Design a protein around this ligand. Structure first.
Ligand SMILES: [Cl-]
Ligand SMILES: [Cl-]
Ligand SMILES: [Cl-]
Ligand SMILES: [Cl-]
Lengths: 534, 534
């Protein structure tokens, strides 16, 4: 009752601190690696001082993809998608991505990616870090139970996400709120205090405008921005999947290197610096966001650590400024172009991310929160509109990268299909009897290794359910039944539209199929969920 | 896929508008009924002018409890608790509370309760109203499906709650956020856009400070304030249940009338007026909150419409001023007593409510949001602290008023009890066979009216599951099987700690018990849930 609370409080505070502490050191290393890169250039002549900027830039992007390659390639990409996977009920399958060795390929990869001048964020990679740190704490005795308990692991790993995100924006509430909107499929309300706690912990560590209600024109920008967020997620997937289908098997540095070079040159006539400046209220700005629209969409498909929030913040603000200026003329001096860049930055990340929180994030960061209402409506419209065309950039990344993700159905399965159509016959799948002697049960045990549940039926087999390992292995250490596991059994005529639901809510690995009482078939979780596996 | 969205969008917008519109009329009717009451007094002499204030005050409190009595006594109390019940999976049981007649006893009762000078809020009653309005639209053809669909009814009735709350605070985000924290057990992330939409709609209708980081002392106030919130919920229940156990069956006006009179007198040496004043930073203030602490606790037990948010706002601010003054002297002029009243009002409502959102609500209302961090920590401590002693005032109210509420277990059932201990034997419960002729099935149908599912088994009965009414009644209109319903079946050794879970997540009315394959018993949802029913 109290040892319960103090255990949990201890964990979340020790997580939140060392999460926002680690991310501070990531940030600290990015601000140094950039200034090094700058010294190299200013020490040589002006002509060569420019090329030594580009050369150093490619080099650090090559070192970035190298870190992933030499340590853990599971550290490539955002990380949020890879996590959305785990919290979806595939912790047993994706447990590999949370290994300590992946923390290094993420945090070394990120420092070098942003260092080398890639148009690449840290929101994703950052959430990924926090989870691995939270997973390491799980290794201490006092905290091990926190992972064991299915329910308690969900809620804690979610707090890792919160502190991961909230540290990326330096906005504690903005963070936790964005967290529940994206990693979660559904959300246990209990966790909200656990996620806030772990976020404020890191805020304390890290402690060591006006938009007129001419809203109608803001909502018009909200609508358009949804359509542009749609196009963005559409671009990411299409630019990506034409590298896989066509020109496939291009390897690492030549790919990353071209984008690094191409980037440093495509930005010849041109981070948190630009933003605040468009937010100030005072040609060559038409190309700015359009170039970065393409450049970023391309870059997050790269085999290296890549977030998307701070980049999309720029792309929005830029479009918001182009709108805020094209409205400056049509409606008079009364229109302020600055406030349209604010609604712009918020609505576009809300187009691409689908997080209504981006409205709160822009407030918490530098925003004064004059009025949410205008910003909150245009952020919403962007979701409703972009929610029509596309799936969320994260969900699309899940498809795009082929990650087991419970809430999307297999491309090849109708919700009308009966469990019978997809179930795996019981004859080939392992099963146990009460009558089968100790001499028997050793057989299945070794011939089906890794099996944790054994379905137990009589002759003319009828349903029960015994464990494998805790009991059978320990009931063997003397030389059956009673059982200890209740499986979610389902009748053979129950269809996918309802198997899929049990998989998302109950989150099991297997569902038993009942035909007239007899155990006739198991349905794997791989049989319904859009799961890449591999 | 578009007719889907536009239907939903049309519903939420037409709900949100008319919800915040109806609540505006309630608010408008309270501001007049109070001014009438004031005219009556100032027309007579000064001596009598005071007694005519009290007499009018009692009268309107009597008329308040009368409205509930003469229309629908289901309109007594908060309403949120009554709703928390519905959204918990008891919509079929508590449907009566959403009847149109109950909207009148709610909104008339409330106008007269606050008019008569009761220390009584509108947050609860207000959420109740919005649901009944939402429920009425449900009757229109285009919207009826929105209620039919189990999942889509949840999400929309949740949006009623959001626009209900958000309007009660005039803080859209604060409202929807407080909503997910309290009505919901878990929360489908989909709804968040539906709730925001329905809230901003009513915001558009309704459109027609500094806390230093001396936070340590704010956290010490957060700690204490949780303990006071605990005592507050402890008081509500104990003052209530001593009226039921002792002096039981006291009826209506004498009860309501004594509290009306007693109140108007107990406040002899003393709403949104006081608040802003303590928030301004510039004996007889020690008694103020303590009197109202008792007075309010007592009043929300009364048989009439009674919210608790705005009253608790006062009680906190008061205690926060008492603290902010006792800190004024101990730490010097550098301490500002005003900002401690703000953290005070937020932390105490966060004590009683357990909503971390009160932090955001205080910001959104008049708050400028200088920094959340100090306020957001103290609001969280208050929850972690009061979360130790007590259950949330709403959950405690659910116990206190004996309402079916899925997530609390029956007072008399251990999670260790096997489903076999609690299951109802299948012989006494209705069942069907494939062999039983049309002459047979007419029997069960009429002798067990109101039955919707019929468990279907063979001779030596083995599990399947047929509907009752859609099929059997229509398959009778010609003079069996195949089945059309899949029931959540569970083995006889599966225990309550896991029946209870299935009831909360899957939200079914019944669970079938499997003993060696044979259907041996039904477990009603009334067998596990702490459900008073009646
Ligand atoms: Cl990715
Ligand atoms: Cl970022
Ligand atoms: Cl109540
Ligand atoms: Cl209120």
């Amino acid at each position: 009752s109290l040892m319960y609370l103090l255990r949990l409080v201890c964990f979340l505070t020790l997580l939140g601190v060392t999460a926002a502490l680690f991310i501070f050191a990531v940030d600290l290393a990015v601000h140094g690696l950039e200034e090094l890169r700058m010294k190299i250039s200013r020490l040589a002549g002006r002509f060569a001082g420019y090329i030594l900027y580009v050369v150093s830039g490619v080099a650090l992007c090559l070192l970035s993809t190298f870190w992933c390659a030499v340590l853990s390639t599971e550290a490539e990409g955002s990380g949020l998608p890879q996590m959305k996977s785990i919290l979806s009920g595939f912790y047993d399958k994706m447990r590999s991505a949370l290994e300590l060795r992946v923390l290094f390929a993420k945090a070394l990869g990120l420092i070098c990616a942003i260092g080398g001048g890639l148009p690449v964020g840290w929101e994703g990679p950052n959430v990924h870090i926090a989870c691995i740190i939270a997973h390491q704490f799980y290794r201490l005795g006092v905290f091990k139970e926190l992972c064991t308990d299915r329910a308690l692991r969900l809620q804690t790993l979610a707090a890792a996400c919160a502190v991961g995100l909230a540290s990326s924006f330096g906005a504690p509430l903005g963070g936790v709120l964005y967290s529940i909107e994206t990693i979660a499929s559904f959300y246990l309300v209990q966790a909200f205090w656990k996620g806030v706690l772990s976020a404020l912990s890191g805020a304390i560590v890290y402690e060591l405008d006006v938009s007129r209600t001419q809203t109608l024109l803001y909502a018009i920008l909200g609508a358009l921005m949804g359509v542009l967020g749609a196009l963005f997620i559409r671009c990411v997937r299409s630019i990506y999947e034409l590298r896989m289908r066509h020109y496939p098997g291009t390897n690492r540095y030549f790919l990353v290197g071209v984008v690094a070079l191409f980037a440093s040159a495509l930005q010849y006539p041109f981070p948190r610096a630009t933003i605040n400046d468009l937010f100030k209220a005072v040609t060559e700005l038409i190309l700015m966001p359009i170039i970065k629209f393409i450049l970023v969409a391309l870059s997050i498909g790269l085999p290296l650590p890549a977030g998307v929030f701070v980049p999309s913040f720029l792309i929005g603000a830029g479009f918001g400024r182009l709108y805020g200026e094209l409205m400056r003329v049509v409606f008079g001096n009364a229109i302020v172009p600055g406030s349209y860049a604010v609604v712009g930055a918020a609505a576009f990340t809300a187009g691409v991310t689908r997080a209504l929180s981006c409205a709160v994030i822009i407030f918490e960061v530098t925003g004064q929160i004059r009025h949410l209402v205008p910003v909150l409506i245009s952020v919403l419209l962007a979701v409703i509109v972009g929610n029509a065309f596309n799936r969320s950039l994260y969900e699309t990344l899940v498809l795009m990268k082929h990650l087991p993700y419970m809430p999307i159905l297999r491309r090849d399965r109708s919700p009308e299909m009966t469990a019978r159509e997809i179930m795996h016959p019981i004859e080939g799948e392992p099963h146990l009897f009460p009558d089968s002697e100790p001499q028997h049960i050793k057989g299945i045990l070794e011939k089906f290794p890794n099996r944790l549940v054994f379905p137990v039926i009589d002759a003319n087999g009828y349903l029960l359910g015994a464990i494998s390992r805790k009991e059978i292995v320990d009931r063997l250490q003397h030389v059956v039944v009673p059982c200890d596991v209740s499986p979610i059994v389902v009748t053979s005529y129950s269809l996918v539209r309802q198997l899929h639901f049990l998989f998302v809510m109950l989150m099991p690995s297997m569902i038993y199929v009942t035909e007239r009482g007899k155990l006739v078939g198991i349905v794997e979780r791989e049989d319904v969920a859009y799961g890449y596996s591999n």
